[PDB]
Design a protein around this ligand. Structure first.
Ligand SMILES: Cc1ncsc1-c1ccc(CNC(=O)[C@@H]2C[C@@H](O)CN2C(=O)[C@@H](NC(=O)C2(F)CC2)C(C)(C)SC[C@H]2CC[C@H](CN3CCOCC3)CC2)cc1
Lengths: 90, 147, 104
């Protein structure tokens, strides 16, 4: 499908399907007032990587009667991930 | 209260199946609408129990009070048994928002007093504080029904 | 049986879903559209071993349980430019801070 690129502070590039990224209203807006790229100056890769995994998880298991697994969040990343979440509104 | 059980006095048999990784606390709304606790179901367990038609159930994490879904909705009302078959109420994890899930993990690791010590924006303290509860979800469901 | 995976090379990472009945070549084609490099120039690896074109994803070991949406499996990528295929180099993600004391 259509893909978009989400870049972290440490310079890692993540290519995610647009519809997966549009899970975040903040990413949506950034995408539209062209480049399909977005730069997150304050989100490091070990957070943004986990954000992309959430995008995959929500899409698959949203509106599905399969037993939903627990989204795994380790303790060492939880506080940073929460911060990213509040900003991304996902 | 619109969200209240009704005294059918008509017995129904249900199987509560926990299809979550969480310890479930079954919650029964009495005829005056008050939430009432019931025996907990550990993960991977199910039980055949007795209830009556028109009685309202909701299902929650026993320790954290996080919201859980019963048959892919929030409320379970036992139907009339058919052919001797128990009605199945399957408790599943919802697809939480990333923020809510992140809050669940932090709350799990940080004592409520120390929430203010975290180096996070203030709006998020208040969020960590607003622990999930049954009283708040009942008002939402009522208004949704009104809609 | 959809499998969910991460395709990584250097500092790039791709998040895509594929069927267990699909192959390396079909996945190399997926890389094409996204990254504009032809299949002849892509080597896809599971761990340190090359995955042979025409081996189904499950055969390669990308089992449905092993590659899950919450915890995707990594399929390595290296590009063949000019003379030699490059060595596999997947840069690590940032290291997390030390857990704060309150959490500790
Ligand atoms: C094992 C397990 N694991 C997770 S949950 C669970 C579990 C466990 C027990 C159940 C019993 N079931 C109900 O309590 C259903 C449910 C709800 O529908 C209300 N309710 C009613 O019984 C209401 N009464 C009435 O509606 C009427 F009289 C009009 C018909 C009522 C709440 C007003 S009386 C409840 C009494 C409780 C005591 C019992 C007698 N003993 C045996 C149990 O303890 C000791 C003494 C007789 C009934 C169900 C599930």
């Amino acid at each position: 499908m259509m893909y978009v690129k989400l870049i972290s502070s440490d310079g890692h590039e993540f290519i995610v399907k647009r519809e997966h990224a549009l899970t975040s209203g903040t990413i949506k807006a950034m995408l539209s007032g062209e480049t399909n790229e977005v730069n997150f100056r304050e989100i490091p890769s070990h957070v943004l990587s986990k954000v992309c995994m959430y995008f995959t998880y929500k899409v698959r298991y949203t509106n599905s009667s399969t037993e939903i697994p627990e989204f795994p969040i380790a303790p060492e990343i939880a506080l940073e991930l929460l911060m990213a979440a509040n900003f991304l509104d996902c | 209260p619109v969200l209240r059980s009704v005294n059918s006095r008509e017995p129904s048999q249900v199987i509560f199946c926990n299809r979550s990784p969480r310890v479930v606390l079954p919650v029964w709304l009495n005829f005056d609408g008050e939430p009432q606790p019931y025996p907990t179901l550990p993960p991977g367990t199910g039980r055949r129990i007795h209830s009556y038609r028109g009685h309202l159930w909701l299902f929650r994490d026993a320790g954290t009070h996080d919201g859980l879904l019963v048959n892919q909705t929030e409320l379970f009302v036992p139907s009339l048994n058919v052919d001797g078959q128990p009605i199945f109420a399957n408790i599943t994890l919802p697809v939480y928002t990333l923020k809510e899930r992140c809050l669940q993990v932090v709350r799990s690791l940080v004592k409520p007093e120390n929430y203010r010590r975290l180096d996070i924006v203030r709006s998020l303290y208040e969020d960590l504080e607003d622990h999930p509860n049954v009283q708040k979800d009942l008002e939402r469901l009522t208004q949704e029904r009104i809609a | 049986m959809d499998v969910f995976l991460m395709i990584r090379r250097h500092k790039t990472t791709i998040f895509t879903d594929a069927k267990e009945s699909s192959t390396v070549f079909e996945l190399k084609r997926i890389v094409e559209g996204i990254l504009k490099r032809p299949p002849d120039e892509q080597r896809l690896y599971k761990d340190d071993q090359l995955l042979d074109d025409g081996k189904t994803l499950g055969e390669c070991g990308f089992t449905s349980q092993t590659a899950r949406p919450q915890a995707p499996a990594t399929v390595g990528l290296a590009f063949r430019a000019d003379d030699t295929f490059e060595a596999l180099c997947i840069e690590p993600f940032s290291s997390p801070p030390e857990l704060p004391d309150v959490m500790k």
